Design an enzyme around this catalytic site. Structure first.
Site, PDB file in Angstrom:
ATOM      1  N   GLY D 137      40.843  26.149  21.926  1.00  0.00           N
ATOM      2  CA  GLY D 137      41.506  26.673  20.749  1.00  0.00           C
ATOM      3  C   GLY D 137      41.811  25.616  19.708  1.00  0.00           C
ATOM      4  O   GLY D 137      41.258  25.644  18.605  1.00  0.00           O
ATOM      5  N   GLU D 247      26.403   1.665  11.337  1.00  0.00           N
ATOM      6  CA  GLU D 247      25.059   1.461  11.869  1.00  0.00           C
ATOM      7  C   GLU D 247      24.694   2.524  12.895  1.00  0.00           C
ATOM      8  O   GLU D 247      23.509   2.819  13.086  1.00  0.00           O
ATOM      9  CB  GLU D 247      24.943   0.068  12.486  1.00  0.00           C
ATOM     10  CG  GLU D 247      25.058  -1.061  11.478  1.00  0.00           C
ATOM     11  CD  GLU D 247      24.880  -2.427  12.110  1.00  0.00           C
ATOM     12  OE1 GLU D 247      24.418  -2.489  13.268  1.00  0.00           O
ATOM     13  OE2 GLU D 247      25.200  -3.437  11.449  1.00  0.00           O
TER      14      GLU D 247
HETATM   15  N1  LIG Z   1      37.862  14.795  30.163  1.00  0.00           N
HETATM   16  C1  LIG Z   1      38.967  15.508  29.970  1.00  0.00           C
HETATM   17  N2  LIG Z   1      38.890  16.824  29.547  1.00  0.00           N
HETATM   18  C2  LIG Z   1      40.023  17.547  29.353  1.00  0.00           C
HETATM   19  C3  LIG Z   1      41.262  16.970  29.577  1.00  0.00           C
HETATM   20  N3  LIG Z   1      42.212  17.890  29.312  1.00  0.00           N
HETATM   21  C4  LIG Z   1      41.605  19.035  28.927  1.00  0.00           C
HETATM   22  N4  LIG Z   1      40.248  18.842  28.954  1.00  0.00           N
HETATM   23  C5  LIG Z   1      39.199  19.820  28.600  1.00  0.00           C
HETATM   24  O1  LIG Z   1      39.639  20.743  27.618  1.00  0.00           O
HETATM   25  C6  LIG Z   1      39.004  21.989  27.839  1.00  0.00           C
HETATM   26  C7  LIG Z   1      39.825  23.156  27.310  1.00  0.00           C
HETATM   27  O2  LIG Z   1      40.380  22.835  26.058  1.00  0.00           O
HETATM   28  P1  LIG Z   1      41.779  22.050  26.006  1.00  0.00           P
HETATM   29  O3  LIG Z   1      41.626  20.711  25.330  1.00  0.00           O
HETATM   30  O4  LIG Z   1      42.279  21.895  27.424  1.00  0.00           O
HETATM   31  O5  LIG Z   1      42.766  23.003  25.166  1.00  0.00           O
HETATM   32  P2  LIG Z   1      43.506  22.462  23.840  1.00  0.00           P
HETATM   33  O6  LIG Z   1      42.750  21.336  23.174  1.00  0.00           O
HETATM   34  O7  LIG Z   1      44.917  22.038  24.168  1.00  0.00           O
HETATM   35  O8  LIG Z   1      43.563  23.739  22.867  1.00  0.00           O
HETATM   36  P3  LIG Z   1      44.420  25.036  23.284  1.00  0.00           P
HETATM   37  O9  LIG Z   1      43.492  26.203  23.506  1.00  0.00           O
HETATM   38  O10 LIG Z   1      45.378  25.375  22.168  1.00  0.00           O
HETATM   39  O11 LIG Z   1      45.170  24.755  24.564  1.00  0.00           O
HETATM   40  C8  LIG Z   1      38.830  22.088  29.342  1.00  0.00           C
HETATM   41  O12 LIG Z   1      37.620  22.733  29.666  1.00  0.00           O
HETATM   42  C9  LIG Z   1      38.810  20.652  29.817  1.00  0.00           C
HETATM   43  O13 LIG Z   1      37.516  20.321  30.261  1.00  0.00           O
HETATM   44  C10 LIG Z   1      41.345  15.656  29.997  1.00  0.00           C
HETATM   45  O14 LIG Z   1      42.449  15.153  30.193  1.00  0.00           O
HETATM   46  N5  LIG Z   1      40.195  14.923  30.195  1.00  0.00           N
END
Ligand SMILES: Nc1nc2c(ncn2[C@@H]2O[C@H](COP(=O)(O)OP(=O)(O)OP(=O)(O)O)[C@@H](O)[C@H]2O)c(=O)[nH]1
Ligand SMILES: Nc1nc2c(ncn2[C@@H]2O[C@H](COP(=O)(O)OP(=O)(O)OP(=O)(O)O)[C@@H](O)[C@H]2O)c(=O)[nH]1
Ligand SMILES: Nc1nc2c(ncn2[C@@H]2O[C@H](COP(=O)(O)OP(=O)(O)O)[C@@H](O)[C@H]2O)c(=O)[nH]1
Ligand SMILES: Nc1nc2c(ncn2[C@@H]2O[C@H](COP(=O)(O)OP(=O)(O)O)[C@@H](O)[C@H]2O)c(=O)[nH]1
Ligand SMILES: [Mg+2]
Ligand SMILES: [Mg+2]
Lengths: 430, 432, 430, 432
Positions: D137, D247
């Site tokens: 989101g 670059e």
């Molecule tokens: N590599 C990595 N990926 C993450 C991490 N935290 C969340 N994700 C990825 O984020 C994806 C889902 O989107 P999120 O970033 O968790 O959600 P958001 O950015 O907080 O946006 P919202 O929907 O409002 O919660 C998941 O499929 C995870 O793979 C993290 O700490 N490390």
């Protein structure tokens, strides 16, 4: 000045080379580090024959060491005289030959040959008048046989006018060291029988006999046989380096020793060879040396000279000498051994004398013989090549490397011609 | 000489490997933890980490965790690279089909990946060493896979393998005749020369020559380790008449389909009995040609020697070797095939055998190992083939192999290939 | 006195510059702080060639350092000789070029070029007789290629009569460092092919080979390759600074080396280049240096000279020398390498000798070659520019900066003409 | 080089940011309280207060207080500027429309104000770093808003973004196919080159290369932090072949619509396993081109490499790099597209990777990061598009997006844009 470049290929090649510069450097008083420490100005007068001077009170021997695996050359670097050679001349491969003439000639050595000739060309360009080449190897060996012949053909094509000597270790008749020696020897003789001007055949069997009885050495080793070989090899070029009443260079020996172009296989010899116990009870004089050098037991070849005849003999003496004594003994050998010389050559002895003797000796002599008895040597190999090749005993290794079976039969025939040509001239006009 | 690669497959090969590397570490003064603390050519079998550590250049493979687990928990645990100790999940259960078709296929890819990485660090690769049991599930089915993969992927390189040839009288498994022939057919073409050793023969040596009344597989491997060490002595030390790895096949393989030499070693004497024997070169040299001393139960006198390699080791004199070899060739009881006037390939190295603490072998400054491609092994092949056809005439255990992805036709083809091998020995065993 | 101003642009430009004044200052004995500590009056006799004296016992090198980002120049300030240059000459931007010739020539460099020329004009006004300019850069680079060409065009327009040298690093054939090198090189050659009088092409691939085998350097770095480059660059102007029997300045080389105006691309070389182990086993004499400098393996260019011919060769020697020996070896090279020189130019060698050698050496020589073999270099770039431009591989970056696609095709054609003109003169009248 | 700006949006981006700045503080010796206490070029990512304090140049943004609240209460609480930690009231709830139309619009203005102030203190701005989740989101809807705003307001500047590309097999949300495509359509034009990383791929690396059996998102971010550190190593240290920020796009973007390179890193070894490997330049160089080591599950062998950037780091020798790269180019299994004869962009920096206390990565003095724009990602796009059309054929979750101010037409337009992107890869993947 007349100059030479030394080439050493294979395990036997390099090791004899190492025990050769250990002796040439001794005669010229060259320190293992390369600095000159000789006690006489007459040694530096002709040092350039084997060495290329490097400014800074050091000399570098123009020698080319070739080996497909680095094992034999690595030991040379660790030797007392390893640091003497120029590092660039140490040219080696990675995949050593499996004692097969094909790999050392066609597949493995073909890639490294270009590198070897470049160093050789630079050494030749470093000279003012190149006189010839020297190759040390072993016919039974794969690297030497295969890579040695490849080098000989290339340098001969590049330098047809120049001479080339070969000190080749020949398989012994009784006890061998490689299973497939008959194939390697016949293939290599097929190349040396048209490319080189003079060859010296040596066999360890004969050298073993010398150590056992002539020298009473209880535990000899290749560190000792190579010393004997190096003595003869150094003796052949005593004239190029030191003065004498009757100087004989490489070419002079070749003309006096090679009647026909294909009959350029000799059997070397040396004298005196006495144990430490026998040193008291023998007089070191010309009359005694002549008998020892013509003795069949002092020969460095398995074949008995008495079974044949001498086309040409060359005697190279060293040390303080009397010409009349030298002339007398050679005349006695001519008359005493009536049937040991061909009738179609009234004079069979080529004498050479040098003023300086070798090491601590006050007298030395080197024997070179182009005797017809060497036919029994190729004949034996001729029988051992036929028996194996008759049913393809080990041919599938040579075939896999590119060699065709047709080349094998041509070398056998070219080997039979050599024996027939030796038997042909053993005859008499009356 | 440059690098040589080692592979240990199966319980027999793996257990032999730990004994072989015990000698290698002792010979070069390498501690069991992989750090040198007492010959700089040890790079043939070891790779330097660059931080004062050495990693042996071996790939231990098995389809079960039991045998490799012992190595991981043994003193040499820190020695081997963790990824080299490749292990499966379920053992081949003495079935050739499992180790070649079903379970062997699952782990073959990982083995090659490590083998490829070992080659990448090679400035020069002489060949491979493969340790396996001539009869056994993992040591016969999985080895064939590697031989096919190594031959096609690399090729143009020596491939030496040590095999526990089934003893004629003693046998520790029921379906060995099926297993031995299947691997022989598939490994005959891709091999260069396979050294053969029996368990019964080494037992007899341990009982007659040595004074050990309680031998074990641990003792046999220690007595087999020096066989491998002598063969690779030239690649790791200096001496007259060096014998490179590729020289063995050229001298000991007159024909492409006859590359099964047997192994003999001498001297083999206990600590006490050594004081009463001079152990001169002729004594050990003559001993190597004694039926009572060879490590294969086949009688050497029942056939003819075709090629022989004498890898003399220690403070030996070349003159003595030549005289001793001459004595052998003049014997009338010994007979060499006519078409090979020259059969002896001598090798001398200046490094006496190392003493393994707690071993049953005495300290000797002069040892020799003999490799002889002799036609007497043809009798052993016939006996092994005799067992196979007797079982196969009734399908004694074929259903196990059939259900593991192997067609019944291979049994007929494999035996016919073995039959041709018997004829090949017969053809080369006579001369006009 | 004849005087020069040095310009360095881009990362390769400045770093080589830094390793160049580290060597010029050494020859003249100039302390890193700028004070003179030389042991010979002959060094100050021609110091003004590269330095503008500042009263107070210090000298300031008239050099202009140009770079669009300050990263490369900041390191220079922190170097051992960083404080030697005048702070005002350090002219730099803020937005570095993204390795695109367009940004370093049209958009980013256009704003800074005015600033650069002002310093250059002051340096020229500080001289009594300006002889030429020197530019160090890299064709594959964006700043050097783009900004270097912009500077060359402006100074050439401003100072048409004066010479201008260029030591340009050329992309290697096998391993590259920038993806879009073909575009940068072709665009830059399009400017250097009409604006500069002589250019020296250098490639790191060739320099890597020298270090590996000729010099046996196990872990070389650009701190080492630049030292080799600086040696040749210093050698070209040995005559402007020190006396000799046969002095050759920049203009003399240009007339003897540039037969046709567009054929002003040379391949530099240097000798002797020997490792520390090889120092013992080699004699530092004229006969040996001549072979090394004409050796294809000692060339600082990937193209093999043997694949072509030499229109003109210039040999610049240093140190105590014998004119006859120098004449002999050049004659030998003329006769020995019969087919390596064009027939329509009877004399191909321009010899120069200086009394003082470089650093601790007692003898040095610099090789300049206008060989036709360099056609294989532009041809390779010609194939790598065509393959990419064939479908606009990376053109959308150059187009966005203002460059039109039409300029790209003109440079390709102007590049094909250069190769055709090189092949044209490789012919023979008979 | 001069300043580079960082932006962290969404839970994935925010959590990655705290890991990235953990490395940055450790690399420059900056304490977690914002005071330097152990390289003066740290001004690229930090602004000096003028009173012995450094403020990181980042803008952490989210629509919920939970993730940012952890940062405010974490050890780095005193590090960041209080106003930089911009937070909303209600999360986007995994809906793209909310983060781009409804709730994202309310907080976008405040974000730009801080971004403008960061630019005001810039003597030179190379570009922006945006951390977000390719599917999510806040990480997909709000990032598109910033990309549009940053492009129009600033423009003519690099805009690098790191995205958590949805893994093919593993997936932690249901409507990701809708979310990923919507942001791709809106961010394709305004982006320069987006580095892609999967959660599954890093898990596999942590399990095979590393010996960690209990990985977590904390471990992944730490293993992703060094990816960002290596990319910006040139801007913060000195070394031969410096690679500026701009670059990357020139070398790795042959066409404006193909700017999605994947990320690989090496060496990746545990503390114990490091002792058994030399880790020479060829070893790490070859490792970077291994399917088993890349951080995107797409098979590199299934396509062709178009451009590659090798950012070597540590005590590396340029000669070794050139020889190693030559070895790669001569491999036949690897294939580069014909129209790009030159694809390698080398970068060397003299600063070995820093050791993060408590981490699972061993200390290595020689590390390399590879960026490769490979056509193999086209398969991943098709699979993601395959998920989208399958859902959209039945309006599986469209009603949520429709009610949040997004018209149904965008779904059709976005997929068609994705379809054209697939065709673009096909067009550039063949040559006459
Ligand atoms: N590599 C990595 N990926 C993450 C991490 N935290 C969340 N994700 C990825 O984020 C994806 C889902 O989107 P999120 O970033 O968790 O959600 P958001 O950015 O907080 O946006 P919202 O929907 O409002 O919660 C998941 O499929 C995870 O793979 C993290 O700490 N490390
Ligand atoms: N000399 C010797 N022989 C062994 C040793 N271990 C096993 N063998 C032989 O191996 C034969 C059976 O094959 P194994 O090697 O044990 O079985 P494997 O190689 O593990 O293959 P699997 O069928 O999968 O178990 C037995 O007849 C033993 O003679 C050992 O340690 N030393
Ligand atoms: N005189 C002498 N002969 C040797 C020595 N070493 C090996 N040989 C001979 O070399 C022959 C073997 O060939 P070899 O050169 O080792 O094979 P290669 O390495 O392929 O050239 C044997 O017949 C030995 O007689 C040595 O040190 N001295
Ligand atoms: N010989 C040499 N070449 C270099 C050096 N540094 C960089 N280069 C070359 O410079 C090229 C990159 O262009 P560069 O000058 O760094 O880009 P710029 O800063 O925009 O001018 C690479 O292809 C390198 O081969 C050096 O120290 N020596
Ligand atoms: Mg088992
Ligand atoms: Mg959230």
């Amino acid at each position: 000045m007349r100059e030479i470049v030394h080439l050493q290929a294979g395990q036997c090649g390099n090791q004899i080379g190492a025990k050769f510069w250990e002796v040439i450097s001794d005669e010229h008083g060259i320190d293992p580090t390369g600095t000159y420490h000789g006690d006489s100005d007459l040694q530096l007068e002709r040092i350039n024959v084997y060495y290329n001077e490097a400014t800074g009170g050091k000399y570098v021997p123009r020698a080319v060491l070739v080996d497909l695996e680095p094992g034999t050359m690595d030991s040379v670097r660790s030797g007392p005289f390893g640091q003497i050679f120029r590092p660039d001349n140490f040219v080696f491969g990675q995949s050593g030959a499996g004692n097969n003439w094909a790999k050392g000639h066609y597949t493995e050595g073909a890639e490294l040959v270009d590198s070897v000739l470049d160093v050789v060309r630079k050494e030749a360009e470093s000279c003012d008048c190149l006189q010839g080449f020297q190759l040390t190897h072993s016919l039974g060996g794969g690297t030497g046989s295969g890579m040695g012949t490849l080098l000989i053909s290339k340098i001969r094509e590049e330098y047809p006018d120049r001479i080339m000597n070969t000190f080749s270790v020949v398989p012994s008749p009784k006890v061998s060291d490689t299973v497939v020696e008959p194939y390697n020897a016949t293939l290599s003789v097929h190349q040396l029988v048209e490319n080189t001007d003079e060859t010296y055949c040596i066999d360890n069997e004969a050298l073993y006999d010398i150590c056992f009885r002539t020298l009473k050495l209880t535990t000899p080793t290749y560190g000792d046989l190579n010393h004997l070989v190096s003595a003869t090899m150094s003796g052949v070029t005593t004239c190029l380096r030191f003065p004498g009443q009757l100087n004989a260079d490489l070419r002079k020996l070749a003309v006096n020793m090679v009647p026909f172009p294909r009959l350029h296989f000799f059997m070397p010899g040396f004298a005196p060879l006495t144990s430490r116990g026998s040193q008291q009870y023998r007089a070191l004089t010309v009359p005694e040396l002549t008998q020892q050098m013509f003795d069949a037991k002092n020969m460095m070849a398995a074949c008995d000279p008495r079974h044949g005849r001498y086309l040409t003999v060359a005697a190279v003496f060293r040390g303080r000498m009397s010409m009349k004594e030298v002339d007398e003994q050679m005349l006695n050998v001519q008359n005493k051994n009536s049937s040991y010389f061909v009738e179609w050559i009234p004079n069979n002895v080529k004498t050479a004398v040098c003023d300086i003797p070798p090491r601590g000796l006050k007298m030395s002599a080197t024997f070179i013989g182009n005797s017809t008895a060497i036919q029994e040597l190729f004949k034996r190999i001729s029988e051992q090549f036929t028996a194996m090749f008759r049913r393809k005993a080990f041919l599938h290794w040579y075939t896999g490397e590119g060699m065709d079976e047709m080349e094998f039969t041509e070398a056998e025939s070219n080997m039979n011609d050599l024996v027939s040509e030796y038997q042909q001239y053993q005859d008499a006009t009356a | 000489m440059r690098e040589c690669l080692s592979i240990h497959i199966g319980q027999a090969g793996v257990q032999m490997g730990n004994a072989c590397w015990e000698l290698y570490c002792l010979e070069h003064g390498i501690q069991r933890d992989g750090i040198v603390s007492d010959d700089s050519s040890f790079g043939t079998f070891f790779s330097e980490t660059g931080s004062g550590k050495h990693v042996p250049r071996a790939v231990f493979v098995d389809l079960e965790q039991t045998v490799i687990g012992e190595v991981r928990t043994g003193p040499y645990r820190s020695l081997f690279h963790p990824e080299q100790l490749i292990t499966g999940k379920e053992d081949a259960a003495n079935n050739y089909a499992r180790g070649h078709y079903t379970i062997g296929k699952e782990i073959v890819d990982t083995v090659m990946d490590r083998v490829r990485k070992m080659a990448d660090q090679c400035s020069g690769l002489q060949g491979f060493l493969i340790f396996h049991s001539f009869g056994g599930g993992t040591g016969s089915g999985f080895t064939s896979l590697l031989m096919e993969r190594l031959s096609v992927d690399y090729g143009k390189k020596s491939k030496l393998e040590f095999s526990v040839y089934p003893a004629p009288q003693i046998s520790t498994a029921v379906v060995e005749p099926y297993n031995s022939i299947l691997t022989t057919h598939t490994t005959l073409e891709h091999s260069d020369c396979a050294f053969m050793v029996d368990n019964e023969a080494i037992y007899d040596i341990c009982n007659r020559n040595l004074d050990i009344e309680r031998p074990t597989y641990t003792n046999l491997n220690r007595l087999i380790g020096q066989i491998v060490s002598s063969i690779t002595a030239s690649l790791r030390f200096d001496g007259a008449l060096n014998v490179d790895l590729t020289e063995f096949q050229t001298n000991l393989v007159p024909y492409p389909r006859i590359h099964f030499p047997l192994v003999t070693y001498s001297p083999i004497i206990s600590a006490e009995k050594a004081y009463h024997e001079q152990l001169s070169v002729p004594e050990i040299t003559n001993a190597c040609f004694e039926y009572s001393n060879q490590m294969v139960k086949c009688d050497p006198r029942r056939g003819k020697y075709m090629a022989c390699c004498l890898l003399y080791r220690g403070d030996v004199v070349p003159k003595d070797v030549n005289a001793a070899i001459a004595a052998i060739k003049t014997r009338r009881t010994i007979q060499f095939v006519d078409w090979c006037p020259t059969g002896f390939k001598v090798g001398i190295n200046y490094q006496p055998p190392t003493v393994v603490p707690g071993g049953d072998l005495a300290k000797v400054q002069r040892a020799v190992c003999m490799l002889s491609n002799t036609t007497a092994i043809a009798e052993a092949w016939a006996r092994l083939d005799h067992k196979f056809d007797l079982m196969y005439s009734k399908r004694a255990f074929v259903h196990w192999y059939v259900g593991e992805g192997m067609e019944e036709g291979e049994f007929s083809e494999a035996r016919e290939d073995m039959a041709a091998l018997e004829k090949d020995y017969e053809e080369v065993g006579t001369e006009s």
